[PDB]
Amino acid sequence: ATFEIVNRCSYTVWAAASKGDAALDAGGRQLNSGESWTINVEPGTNGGKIWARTDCYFDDSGSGICKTGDCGGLLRCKRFGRPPTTLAEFSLNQYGKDYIDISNIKGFNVPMNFSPTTRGCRGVRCAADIVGQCPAKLKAPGGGCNDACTVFQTSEYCCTTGKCGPTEYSRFFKRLCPDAFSYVLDKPTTVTCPGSSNYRVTFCPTA
């Protein structure tokens, strides 16, 4: 499948694309305002994610640090990023269907639009100013708005027993972005698309 990742933000992001134990395509790249990066993702890839990293500083070796989403200090991510990270999540060619969602379960850093560029399903978006409205206890000094599992490490926020309910923190993310997952047992906002669809992930889709 083809993903075109577009930075419409006024600031530079560092895009990342991984399935947890491996890079997807090159794994990461700098995107200046307006730039677009087209990657190829193997069919059948399950549990892929795409996210933005902010305020990175890297050397000529591809090694360094990002204030949000850092993936063990590497430009080219092989693993998932450190919260807070707004996530575009995808499972592809799963019994003939693709499944996509946006998730705030690991917090929010950058607004996002995640849509198919081929026919037969709708896209999803989380485009509200979550960072500006973030509750004081969930503010990340680095930038971003952390989820409450990251911040407090409780069974209830992390849904460690497999039973957990909505919380005052999950409801904050949900009020601002109804179409993203706000906690592990949220009513699914998954979109089912035809198998082998192609997609575009845009950062700051309205901004």
Side-chain angles (χ1 to χ4, degrees), residues 27-99:
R29 219 200 77 185
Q30 193 164 341
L31 286 168
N32 285 331
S33 177
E35 292 189 326
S36 311
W37 172 34
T38 287
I39 66 173
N40 179 73
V41 175
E42 196 166 21
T45 291
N46 146 276
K49 301 187 195 305
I50 284 165
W51 69 99
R53 299 171 284 173
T54 58
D55 286 303
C56 307
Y57 299 90
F58 293 116
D59 70 22
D60 309 303
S61 266
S63 206
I65 188 164
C66 297
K67 288 226 179 50
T68 63
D70 187 85
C71 59
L74 287 189
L75 191 42
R76 296 182 197 74
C77 296
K78 223 196 168 266
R79 83 218 247 309
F80 298 136
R82 185 168 194 278
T85 57
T86 325
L87 300 167
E89 304 187 310
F90 45 95
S91 302
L92 315 178
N93 306 104
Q94 298 301 308
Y95 304 99
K97 300 302 195 182
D98 288 354
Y99 297 93

